[PDB]
Amino acid sequence: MGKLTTHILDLTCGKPAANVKIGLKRLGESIMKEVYTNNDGRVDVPLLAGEELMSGEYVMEFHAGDYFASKNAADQPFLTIVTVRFQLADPDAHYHIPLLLSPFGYQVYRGS
Amino acid sequence: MGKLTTHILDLTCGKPAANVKIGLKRLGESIMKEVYTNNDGRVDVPLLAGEELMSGEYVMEFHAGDYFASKNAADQPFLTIVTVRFQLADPDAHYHIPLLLSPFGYQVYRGS
Amino acid sequence: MGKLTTHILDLTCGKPAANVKIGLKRLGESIMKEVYTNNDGRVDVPLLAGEELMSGEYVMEFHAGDYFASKNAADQPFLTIVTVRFQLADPDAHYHIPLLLSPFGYQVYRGS
Amino acid sequence: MGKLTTHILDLTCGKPAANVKIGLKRLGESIMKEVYTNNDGRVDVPLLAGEELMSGEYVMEFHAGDYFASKNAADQPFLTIVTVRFQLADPDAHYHIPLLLSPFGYQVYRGS
Ligand SMILES: Nc1[nH]c(=O)[nH]c(=O)c1N
Ligand SMILES: Nc1[nH]c(=O)[nH]c(=O)c1N
Numbered sequence: 001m002g003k004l005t006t007h008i009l010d011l012t013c014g015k016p017a018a019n020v021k022i023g024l025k026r027l028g029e030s031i032m033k034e035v036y037t038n039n040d041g042r043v044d045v046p047l048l049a050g051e052e053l054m055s056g057e058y059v060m061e062f063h064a065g066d067y068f069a070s071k072n073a074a075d076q077p078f079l080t081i082v083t084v085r086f087q088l089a090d091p092d093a094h095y096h097i098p099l100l101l102s103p104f105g106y107q108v109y110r111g112s
Numbered sequence: 113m114g115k116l117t118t119h120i121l122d123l124t125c126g127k128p129a130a131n132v133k134i135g136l137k138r139l140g141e142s143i144m145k146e147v148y149t150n151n152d153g154r155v156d157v158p159l160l161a162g163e164e165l166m167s168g169e170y171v172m173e174f175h176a177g178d179y180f181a182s183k184n185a186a187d188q189p190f191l192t193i194v195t196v197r198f199q200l201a202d203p204d205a206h207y208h209i210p211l212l213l214s215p216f217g218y219q220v221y222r223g224s
Numbered sequence: 225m226g227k228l229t230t231h232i233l234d235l236t237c238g239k240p241a242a243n244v245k246i247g248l249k250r251l252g253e254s255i256m257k258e259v260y261t262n263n264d265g266r267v268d269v270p271l272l273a274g275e276e277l278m279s280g281e282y283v284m285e286f287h288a289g290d291y292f293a294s295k296n297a298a299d300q301p302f303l304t305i306v307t308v309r310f311q312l313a314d315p316d317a318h319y320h321i322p323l324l325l326s327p328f329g330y331q332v333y334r335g336s
Numbered sequence: 337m338g339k340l341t342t343h344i345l346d347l348t349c350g351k352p353a354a355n356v357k358i359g360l361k362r363l364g365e366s367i368m369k370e371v372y373t374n375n376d377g378r379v380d381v382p383l384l385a386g387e388e389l390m391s392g393e394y395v396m397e398f399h400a401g402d403y404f405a406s407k408n409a410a411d412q413p414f415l416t417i418v419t420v421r422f423q424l425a426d427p428d429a430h431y432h433i434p435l436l437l438s439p440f441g442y443q444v445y446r447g448s
Binding site: 119121123126127128152153210212219221222223224 | 343345347350351352376377434436443445446447448
């Protein structure tokens with residue numbers, strides 16, 4: 001009954017980054033889910049929960065490039081697809097991993 | 113004559129993270145270089161420079177898991193191999209991309 | 225009917241930082257409130273809301289020093305009282321300003 | 337023979353933030369120095385060094401508000417004067433405390 005959620009904040013406008021594509025995939029595998037964030041910069045239903053979530057490593061592809069493109073950040077952006085690898089150990093624990101994003105930097109952390 | 117350098121800071125001890133393995137690879141490809149940081153938490157010679165550096169996307173595998181392991185952060189660490197994707201547009205420009213690291217979060221940015 | 229909330233994450237343990245003292249004060253003035261965070265690393269009731277909240281600058285004194293002291297980070301900590309100044313412009317808007325904390329660094333941002 | 341240096345990176349343009357005013361002051365006291373960063377986003381001569389530097393707490397007033405104003409971030413900016421308190425324990429040690437800055441967030445850390 002574990003859960004994996006996320007959250008994106010656009011540190012340039014100080015508002016949640018919405019409609020940003022998020023790819024999720026098991027380590028080694030290829031995309032298994034592809035979600036687009038809502039206005040609060042989240043996804044209605046967790047990226048993982050219950051049976052789905054299983055100890056091991058995962059990666060999330062935040063499509064920062066396209067996000068900033070829709071706002072402006074160039075024709076060959078420094079940050080294209082911000083990738084994040086991590087390992088969920090406890091299959092029943094909750095994992096909130098937000099992404100603080102800027103055109104030239106980002107914060108990856110385990111919130112709650 | 114461009115250049116790509118990096119730098120790792122252990123925000124838990126407030127000291128540069130040394131002997132942390134860093135894998136570098138072109139987007140799509142597999143490891144092409146594998147360096148271990150010195151005491152200042154850097155690498156004597158840039159990861160890329162001159163001819164080697166060529167516009168396109170690259171990924172860096174910082175081996176955070178093992179680093180914290182040598183200090184402590186568990187038997188199945190949240191952060192195992194912190195991965196970073198980015199795109200170098202100008203083949204002649206300099207790119208300093210440090211990694212501020214913590215057992216549960218990290219900052220990726222374009223310094224100088 | 226605006227609101228000002230906060231939130232503290234201990235990036236070293238990956239858990240919310242609780243019972244951390246938080247001083248709040250108007251720019252120029254002295255402490256006007258002093259709260260201690262609960263287990264989720266928040267405060268039951270916002271630091272400001274409704275009439276109380278008024279456009280202008282404010283400062284928050286997060287007592288990081290004592291927090292890490294209760295866990296370990298030294299006898300003369302680098303970070304003692306992490307201070308944060310900011311300006312609430314719209315008296316009716318919501319302001320969630322979390323603090324990502326580490327013994328040697330911290331992230332201050334406007335979440336939501 | 338200790339030293340205290342700083343450094344500012346504009347995470348929005350990915351370039352060092354220059355000509356940003358930096359106030360320095362002992363805990364309790366008022367401004368004792370006021371420097372403006374050069375193009376590399378640093379100051380030619382350290383904010384403190386040798387005899388000047390003495391164990392105790394200090395605060396730095398980065399004038400983020402005006403910086404972003406010269407680029408754009410509003411008529412009543414969220415971040416006006418980003419303030420940073422810290423404590424230098426060893427009078428002979430070096431302290432590099434960079435500031436990663438964004439219009440709605442910032443990273444404060446002990447680099448090297
Ligand atoms: N405080 C808080 N609340 C959320 O709902 N999401 C988040 O990311 C943070 N940091
Ligand atoms: N100021 C500074 N200097 C370096 O040499 N490396 C770095 O990462 C930063 N931020």
